[PDB]
Design a protein around this ligand. Structure first.
Ligand SMILES: [Mg+2]
Length: 282
């Protein structure tokens, strides 16, 4: 399972296998490191209410020397949470006409459960390119949550956001999502492969989510109106994001109260073996 797979009949567009020395930062040619509490001129607290400050500190984001990236939330003596959020420089990931785009990452979630896990919000996701530099055309431009998880739970959510917010056809801010337990080892205790496919070889087109090859969510083109679909697909494509947020809308909603709490335990890393993007056709 380890390392970027050599998929037959597909063409690798872009990947990062996170190879390199322990403690070094992932490639700045590949990645932008987002810092602070918002995009510049964007919604406060990353649009979610999460409370961590994102950094470029190796303590929050670094390679492990074994081929993985680690993103680690930490809590200072002053009580401040820090973490990291990286996004791809490339923002043109999109299926070729009539083809399929496959986006995938192999990840172990922060290995923490129960009250110690309250607030942990790891995610691997994609945002429509027109958002970059604008920050106020969400959800119209589209968002694919390929792996989303909160609170150390043995469950992955896969979600589409689209339309307008609040409300609209994608029921924002919930989005159109589904979830399932990780197959085999819990999502926290081992590596799993989280895959998303955007399929234009079929009509209606389809968006599909998988964990370890188990298909658990679909959104089809015939389930949304034409303007909503065009708004999230007609532009130049998507960029990808990896982060671990602390607190905010999703972990608070699932816990039923504010997170993190004094009992949340810092220092539990999300571990990422690779991220990759493929187009169908060899
Ligand atoms: Mg790797």
């Amino acid at each position: 399972g380890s390392s970027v797979p050599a998929y037959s009949g597909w063409t690798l567009v872009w990947a990062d296998d996170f190879t390199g020395p322990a403690g070094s930062l992932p490639s700045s040619e590949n990645w932008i490191f987002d810092t602070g509490h918002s995009y510049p001129g964007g919604p406060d607290n990353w649009g979610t209410g999460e409370i961590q400050r994102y950094t470029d500190d190796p303590a929050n984001v670094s390679l492990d020397g074994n081929g993985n990236l680690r993103i680690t939330p930490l809590r200072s003596a002053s009580g401040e949470w820090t973490s990291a959020r990286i996004e791809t420089r490339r923002a043109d990931f999109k299926p070729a006409p009539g083809g399929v785009l496959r986006i995938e990452a192999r990840i172990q979630l922060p290995n923490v459960t129960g009250e110690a896990a309250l607030g942990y919000w790891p995610a691997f996701w994609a945002l429509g390119s027109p958002y970059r530099g604008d920050y106020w055309n969400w959800p119209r431009i589209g968002e694919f949550d390929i792996m989303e998880n909160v609170n150390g739970l043995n469950r992955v959510w896969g979600v589409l956001h689209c339309g307008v917010a609040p409300g609209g056809p994608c029921n924002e801010y919930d989005g159109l999502g589904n979830s399932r337990e990780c197959p085999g080892t819990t999502c926290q205790a081992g590596m799993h492969t989280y895959r998303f496919e955007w399929d234009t070889s079929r009509s209606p087109n389809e968006l599909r989510w998988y964990v370890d090859g188990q298909h658990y969510h679909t959104i089809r083109q015939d389930q949304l109106d034409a303007t909503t679909w065009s708004n999230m697909t007609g532009h130049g494509g998507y960029f990808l994001l990896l982060n671990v947020a602390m607190g905010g809308a999703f972990p608070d909603g699932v816990a039923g109260h504010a997170t993190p709490t004094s009992a949340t335990v810092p220092g539990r890393s999300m571990i990422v073996d690779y991220v990759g993007v493929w187009q169908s056709g060899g």
